[PDB]
Amino acid sequence: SMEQVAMELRLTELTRLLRSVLDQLQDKDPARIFAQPVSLKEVPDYLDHIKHPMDFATMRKRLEAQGYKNLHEFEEDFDLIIDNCMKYNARDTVFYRAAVRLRDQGGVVLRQARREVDSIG
């Protein structure tokens, strides 16, 4: 149906915008601390601590399958990156501090993305 197509076009356009949002967020992580999943080889106990791991590569895989239906879903995954890190790592670590900076800086990007997703429908 033509209605199915138009919905598909909306999803595709959301996917384009989310990809630019994701690039912008990831530039706020120049050290690449959040680029890849936490390794179970190097933190074998990680899943005893963190129930829903997340990282930018896993987000990017989801995005390219057009797996985000709305900005809320995408923000949930970004928030897990930050929130997981701030629970697992202590305050006085390079990891925790990189999370705080990504959160603070990413908030600006997300503030306007919310306006763009509302605005362009």
From Swiss-Prot:
Source organism superkingdom: Eukaryota
Record cross-link Glycyl lysine isopeptide (Lys-Gly) (interchain with G-Cter in SUMO2), residues: 41
Localization terms from the record: Nucleus; Chromosome
Domain Bromo: residue ranges: 9-113
Tissues with expression: Highly expressed in testis.
Complexes and interactors: Component of some HBO1 complex composed of KAT7/HBO1, MEAF6, ING4 and BRD1/BRPF2. Component of the MOZ/MORF complex composed at least of ING5, KAT6A, KAT6B, MEAF6 and one of BRPF1, BRD1/BRPF2 and BRPF3. Interacts (via PHD-type zinc finger domain) with unmodified histone H3. Interacts (via PWWP domain) with dimethylated and trimethylated 'Lys-79' on histone H3.
Entry function: Scaffold subunit of various histone acetyltransferase (HAT) complexes, such as the MOZ/MORF and HBO1 complexes, that acts as a regulator of hematopoiesis. Plays a key role in HBO1 complex by directing KAT7/HBO1 specificity towards histone H3 'Lys-14' acetylation (H3K14ac), thereby promoting erythroid differentiation.
Name of the molecule in the record: Bromodomain-containing protein 1
Organism: Homo sapiens (Human)
Residues of the full protein shown: 555 to 674 of 1058
